Design an enzyme around this catalytic site. Structure first.
Site, PDB file in Angstrom:
ATOM      1  N   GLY A 175       0.436 -36.175  35.756  1.00 10.31           N
ATOM      2  CA  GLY A 175       0.889 -37.540  35.518  1.00 10.31           C
ATOM      3  C   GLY A 175      -0.081 -38.500  34.817  1.00 10.31           C
ATOM      4  N   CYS A 231      -0.928 -38.303  31.694  1.00 12.82           N
ATOM      5  CA  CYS A 231      -0.441 -38.375  30.329  1.00 12.82           C
ATOM      6  C   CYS A 231       0.040 -39.726  29.893  1.00 12.82           C
ATOM      7  CB  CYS A 231       0.738 -37.445  30.207  1.00 12.82           C
ATOM      8  SG  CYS A 231       0.249 -35.732  30.349  1.00 12.82           S
ATOM      9  N   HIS A 233       6.449 -35.778  24.530  1.00 11.38           N
ATOM     10  CA  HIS A 233       6.850 -34.735  25.461  1.00 11.38           C
ATOM     11  C   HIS A 233       7.607 -35.265  26.717  1.00 11.38           C
ATOM     12  CE1 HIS A 233       2.704 -34.829  27.590  1.00 11.38           C
ATOM     13  NE2 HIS A 233       3.586 -34.944  28.574  1.00 11.38           N
TER      14      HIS A 233
END
Length: 300
Positions: A142, A144, A41
């Protein structure tokens, strides 16, 4: 001593963490050998509508990548897409790459999370992979790409890479082969997990940890045979006990067989009445057997 929630050290992992930026989006990546792993993503333009990833991969331009380790830029040369991740090939090899493998976690396996933000480790904590394929972590924007890991046999097992937060607050990652745990999607729609079940196996271990320490008040002598524990469990939010045998703890502080804890569990599920057990106020499924034998016996 006692039983406390704990992580395995993070130093072999911190060196593997990088900032992966793609256009506007910033998140973490995991640099092993000449490959940076990260959530796919990163390259989506708009995380707000259904995302067509085949199309998103098709219009990817690599010069939009910037990947940083510490203070150093890594030169991207290739990237391919594998499930819900991205393997970005770079020219630099990570000379701090530890001995390592990749494993896919099973219901109720414990692991470690290294919570990272701008490519830098900010915190570390032990979590279990839950029955409904989520964790209760603590992340914000953030996180991820943050890696989950284990240390075992003098190598580093990579098991988790952080992907999304659901409506509930529960968290979900994928394994390093790109499979989301629980089949969840990297899309911005509402997804609802199957309900959590307490892990019986860990509540047992926890009661044994209790017995190994001084804590016995809750311990009666009435038994409750496995199949009648399961009947009760399938209707009160607990996993089936199916692994009776994994106890030699049954024999260490013997007297206590598995079936007196499975009863203790019945009675205790409905309150401790202000008493406590290893400092907790209700049944606790956050320690596996392994985790208990490690802190009682320095096992490892």
């Amino acid at each position: 001593a006692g039983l406390r929630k704990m992580a395995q050290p993070s130093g072999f992992v911190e060196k593997c963490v990088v900032r992966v930026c793609y256009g506007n989006t910033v998140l973490n990546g995991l640099w092993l050998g000449d490959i940076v792993y990260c959530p796919r993503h990163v390259i989506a333009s708009n995380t707000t509508s259904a995302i067509d990833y085949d199309h998103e991969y098709s219009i990817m331009r690599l010069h939009n990548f910037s990947i940083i380790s510490g203070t150093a830029f890594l030169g991207v040369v290739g990237a391919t897409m594998h499930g819900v991740t991205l393997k970005i090939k770079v020219s630099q090899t990570n000379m701090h790459t530890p001995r390592h493998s990749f494993r896919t976690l099973k219901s109720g396996e414990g692991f470690n999370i290294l919570a990272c933000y701008d490519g830098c480790a900010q915190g570390v904590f032990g979590v279990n992979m839950r029955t409904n394929w989520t964790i209760r972590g603590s992340f914000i924007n953030g996180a991820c790409g943050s890696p989950g890991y284990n240390l075992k046999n003098g190598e580093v097992e990579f098991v988790y890479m952080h992907q999304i937060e659901l409506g509930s607050g529960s968290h979900v990652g994928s394994s390093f082969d790109g499979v989301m745990y629980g089949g969840f999607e990297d899309q911005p729609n509402l997804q609802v997990e199957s309900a959590n079940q307490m892990l019986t196996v860990n509540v047992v271990a926890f009661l044994y940890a209790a017995i190994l320490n001084g804590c016995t008040w809750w311990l009666k002598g009435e038994k409750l045979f496995v199949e009648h524990y399961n009947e009760w469990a399938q209707a009160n939010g607990f996993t089936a006990m199916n692994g009776e045998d994994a106890f030699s703890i049954l024999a260490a502080k013997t007297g206590v067989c598995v079936e007196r804890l499975l009863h203790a569990i019945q009675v205790l599920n409905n309150g401790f009445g202000g008493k406590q057990i290893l400092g907790y106020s209700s049944l606790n499924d956050e320690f596996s057997i392994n985790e208990v034998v490690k802190q009682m016996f320095g096992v490892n």
